[PDB]
Symmetry: C3
Subunit: 142 residues, 3 copies
């Protein structure tokens, strides 16, 4: 029940992080409005087009997949090499990946940060679910 609940943590959170890494940036280096009105780069905000929705997206899209990942990686992981439980694990991949993606996607389109409202808490709250499930178990093991 253990090792498998972890398999998909690779597949799914790769997509989540590093395929959203490979899409974003790859889509960016082709669309390059950079070499902007003659520049060395840095400073994001000459035309709206170039950087306005992108500099957020590149940051946000990176932000989202950055923020969730570690809490869902390590908290799980150092609990995961200890003999933990099935169902329990599986629902975190459903609360995290779904908690994040409805978090990530809502915050990319509509520009407004308040939209990051509803899912941002769905990401915060399996960290109340994960962290403790470690604590009582590991303490149970010893």
């Amino acid at each position: 029940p253990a090792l498998p609940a972890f398999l998909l943590c690779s597949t799914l959170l790769v997509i989540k992080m590093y395929v959203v890494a490979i899409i974003t940036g790859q889509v960016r280096l082709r669309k390059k409005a950079f070499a902007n009105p003659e520049d060395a780069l840095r400073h994001g905000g000459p035309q709206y087009c170039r950087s306005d929705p992108d500099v957020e997206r590149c940051l946000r899209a990176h932000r989202n997949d950055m923020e969730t990942i570690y809490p869902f990686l390590f908290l799980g992981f150092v609990y995961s090499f200890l003999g933990p439980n099935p169902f329990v694990a599986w629902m975190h991949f459903l609360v995290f990946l779904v908690g994040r993606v409805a978090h990530t996607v809502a915050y990319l389109g509509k520009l407004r940060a308040p939209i990051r409202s509803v899912t941002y808490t769905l990401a915060q709250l399996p960290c109340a679910s994960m962290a403790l499930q470690i604590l009582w178990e590991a303490a149970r093991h010893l």
Copy 2:
């Protein structure tokens, strides 16, 4: 001895990566100082009442909660499920962290960087202590 040691290392960094983020989320967004001069949402350097502290404050925390984390989790864990030692495990969590938290609320409150200069050194060395205390176990094994 091993698994109680890496035990409380989840909880230090659920309060530290994710309690801090949750608050710096929760209080930032309740008094939401956005919907700014009728703006499609980005930016963050007009009103001192709005951003200056917050934009510092919030990215201050994240920037600190991320950086020392990486080489604490990664570095520790390649070396955990391997065969560790106690007073050494148990310093790294307290050395790193109190190497971080008085680095993190320091740079927080008073804006001026000088502040972070000491305690950040008090944390950096731990990545070497871990580095060498990791590598020797890694050398005993071979």
Copy 3:
């Protein structure tokens, strides 16, 4: 021979995420021309010798250090305590680093971004072969 592959995983990436995090702060807080023309800080971009390469390089190395870590270690951790193979986990550990070092450094140097387009695919493709090597092997442990 598992750990054999893994023992310099921990260390070499100290040179990457925290010996680079180190000099870059050690060096910055030191060289620092902060106190910037009368300044309670935040905002790093008046005079070039002070702000432009610094704030960039600081963050140029950083953001690059950040993004190689996760797929590499986290994908490499799950599938690690599991029964892997040296060559394999030697290919993945080597190519990534020598692919990301040319990536980080490139961008780091000539302020421009287009110089990064090259080795980040030579970083992202290991992401793609590591991410499968998890699932495949991780299907053979069940």
